């Protein structure tokens, strides 16, 4: 019954804005980072793979290089928050979050970006 919840499954964002999209999971205490994996994708593109307490930047898609963060202090609250800097039409699509923390779950989120 490990469940990920998304406060919003649809974001509509303005061109050039920063955006933070959220996926929540149960955390009451200090994270076991040996066990925690957070994986964000959009449209089969690797945005962030977080494993052993670090973003694996080797596997990150070039479209997200120095444009994406997984907000580490939100993770400590059970919030896998993906921040994209300076959103463009390329960032419109279907995103998916995966959290693994004694069980794994996966949620889809649509992002619509408005014209420049």
């Amino acid at each position, epitope marked *: 019954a490990f469940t990920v919840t998304v406060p919003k499954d649809l974001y509509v964002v303005e061109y050039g804005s920063n955006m933070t999209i959220e996926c929540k999971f149960p955390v009451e205490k200090e994270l076991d980072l040996a066990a925690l994996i957070v*994986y964000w994708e959009m*449209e*089969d593109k*690797n945005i962030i793979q977080f494993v052993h307490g670090e973003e*694996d930047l080797k*596997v990150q898609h070039s479209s997200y290089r120095q444009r994406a963060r997984l907000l580490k202090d939100q993770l400590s609250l059970g919030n896998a928050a993906l921040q994209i800097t300076d959103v463009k039409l390329q960032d419109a699509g279907v995103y998916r979050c995966m959290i693994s923390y004694g069980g794994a779950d996966y949620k889809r989120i649509t992002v619509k970006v408005n014209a420049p």
Partner: nanobody, 127 residues
């Protein structure tokens, strides 16, 4: 509690066709990348085909491109491999696999990226 069950394997003439099916139970796999792998006796298990959780990205090892087609039916929790133009190289046990927690580290074509595996179905091309 998760089970993947493959069916549809058999003996086929070179040039012929078969359709493999995998029925998943225990949880809904709609949001998971899914794949077929194959393994011949005494050889490394290899990626064959992969389908995205989007439902609309398909990926193939070069030697099966144009011959094999992967598809899924999220209402039935099933994955399919349509195999056409079968060749001697295709003789193997075929496994259907569901995305694992290290998919983002390992990549679509690596065994390490999938945590759930069926028992396999044997395909034999007359050679």
């Amino acid at each position: 509690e998760v089970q993947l069950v493959e069916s549809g394997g058999g003996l086929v003439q070179a040039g012929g066709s078969l359709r493999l099916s995998c029925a998943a139970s225990g949880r809904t796999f709609s949001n998971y990348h899914m794949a077929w792998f194959r393994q011949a006796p005494g050889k490394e298990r290899e990626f064959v085909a992969g389908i995205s959780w989007t439902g609309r990205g398909t990926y193939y090892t070069d030697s099966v491109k144009g011959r094999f087609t992967i598809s899924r039916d999220n209402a039935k929790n099933t994955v399919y491999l349509q195999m056409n133009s079968l060749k001697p190289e295709d003789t193997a046990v075929y496994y259907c696999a569901a995305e694992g927690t290290l998919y983002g580290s390992g990549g679509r074509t690596h065994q390490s990226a999938y945590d759930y595996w069926g028992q396999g179905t044997q395909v034999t091309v007359s050679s």
